[PDB]
Design goal:
InterPro entries: UDP_glucos_trans (IPR002213), UDP_glycos_trans_CS (IPR035595). The chain is α/β, with parallel strands linked by helices. Helices cover 44% and strands 14% of the residues.
Length: 441
């Protein structure tokens, strides 16, 4: 069968889709991957084996057919892209009809929510790849459908009681739904809400989580909405100095610090982390991506810290997280990174910034039981002073509850491995998706 996975541009939407693609191909399908060509050429330079002809995976194949951007020159770009996509996609699609390749399904992610309008037009089924938590999905669903009270301009600090979810404070709901947002991400709140509008065009929502993580909610949510938990995707389908340096340390001794490829902190926040690390003489591996302007450390930092500390510009993070030397993971709590902590059994120190990170942070600490809270996200707008950073790091590594949180972390590691086992929840869900596609045939 032929499925067509078009993703909005940008790292955090293209990579989760590719992971899905590689796994649908491994089950024999013919998976075409599309993205805006303006993002495609940059995809061509960084990675090879993508500028070419099909790539073979298992009994399946993956091809790339980048949507013609006609963009050579964000809210201006979102408009342009939608009109050009709605004009180009259908003949791209029929070129496969002419050539004997009738497309059996179209999968998008929520940051091109007009795609299912296309799929309805040309009679091709539409599926949605949701890359955030299921709490995040339920939040948007209950917001768009006005099913539960959320904070408003008139009551900005209101609490939110979603079903089969803990109470969320006003600043714990995903920030795209909070009323006071910058104009840049009004265009992101718009896309989310359009996707909830176009959910009625969509027959299946594939969620990058696993049943046991959000079990009671997925059972509630699935009666209203067609959710299939299929994650974590990074587990399903896949700096020597980093791992070499890590092998030299004792087990459960390195504080790992990484805020993913997008989050740049304020310099003042960087300075308080650095002095905290220095003050408590902990081992640490700190990823400081260079751009924004490039951070600077305290004078003599590298020297004073010594063999305990190591700052890198890039990390093999999936390899780093599985390493036994890690004592904990200071993280921005993006969903993929939160799952990566869970799957690998490592405690978190939550420093959420924007978006769903404030929701993931709450769940990491107060639901999943795998770490401590260091900040509350962008609406706090306070620099987390060194004293508190030192406090949480000792809490997460030697405090009264530190081995309790290690225990929860390992039980979630265990549960994540079962979801993707041959007979696990997520493997089954992805098979039944593939089944429904065949029974469309």
């Amino acid at each position: 069968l032929h499925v067509f996975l078009v993703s909005a541009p940008g790292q955090g939407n293209v990579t989760p889709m590719l992971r899905l693609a590689k796994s649908l191909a491994s089950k024999g399908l013919l998976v075409t991957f599309s993205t805006p060509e303006s993002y495609g050429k940059e995809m061509r330079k960084t990675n090879d084996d993508i500028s070419d002809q099909p790539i073979l995976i298992g009994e399946g194949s993956i091809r790339f057919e980048f949507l013609d951007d006609e963009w050579d020159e964000l809210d201006a770009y979102a408009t342009h892209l939608e009109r050009v996509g709605k004009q180009n996609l259908p003949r791209m699609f029929k070129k496969h009809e002419e050539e004997g390749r009738p497309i059996s399904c179209i999968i998008n992610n929520p940051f091109i929510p007009w795609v299912p309008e296309v799929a309805e037009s040309l009679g091709i089924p539409s599926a949605l790849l949701w890359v955030q938590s299921c709490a995040s999905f339920s939040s948007y669903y209950h917001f768009f459908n006005d099913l539960v009270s959320f904070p408003t301009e008139s009551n900005l600090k209101k609490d939110v009681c979603l079903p089969s979810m803990p109470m969320l404070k006003y600043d714990e709901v995903p920030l795209l739904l909070y009323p006071i947002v910058p104009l840049p991400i009004i265009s992101l709140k718009n896309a989310m809400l359009r996707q909830q509008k176009n959910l009625s065009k969509t027959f299946c929502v594939l969620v990058d989580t696993f049943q046991q993580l959000e079990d009671e909610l997925i059972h509630y949510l699935s009666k209203l909405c067609p959710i299939r938990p299929i994650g974590p995707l990074f587990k399903i389908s896949d700096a020597d100095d980093c791992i070499e340096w890590l092998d030299s340390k004792s087990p459960s001794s390195v504080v790992y610090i990484s805020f993913g490829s997008i989050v740049h902190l304020k310099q003042e926040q960087i300075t308080e982390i650095a002095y905290a690390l220095m003050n408590i003489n902990i081992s640490f591996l700190w990823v400081m991506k260079p751009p924004d302007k490039q951070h600077v450390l305290p004078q003599g930092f590298l020297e004073k810290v010594g063999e305990k500390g190591k700052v890198v510009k890039w990390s093999p993070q999936e390899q780093v997280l599985s390493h036994q030397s890690l004592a904990c993971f200071v993280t921005h709590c993006g969903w993929n990174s939160s799952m990566e902590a869970l799957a690998n059994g490592i405690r978190v120190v939550t420093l959420p910034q924007w978006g769903d990170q404030v929701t993931n942070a709450k769940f990491l600490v107060d639901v999943f039981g795998v770490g401590v809270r260091l900040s509350r996200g962008d609406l706090e707008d306070r620099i987390i002073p060194r004293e508190e950073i030192e406090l949480r790091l000792l809490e997460v590594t030697s405090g009264e509850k530190a081995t309790e949180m290690k225990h929860n972390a390992l039980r979630w590691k265990k549960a994540a491995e079962e979801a993707v086992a041959k007979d696990g929840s997520s493997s089954k869900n992805l098979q039944e998706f593939v089944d429904e596609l065949n029974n469309f045939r």
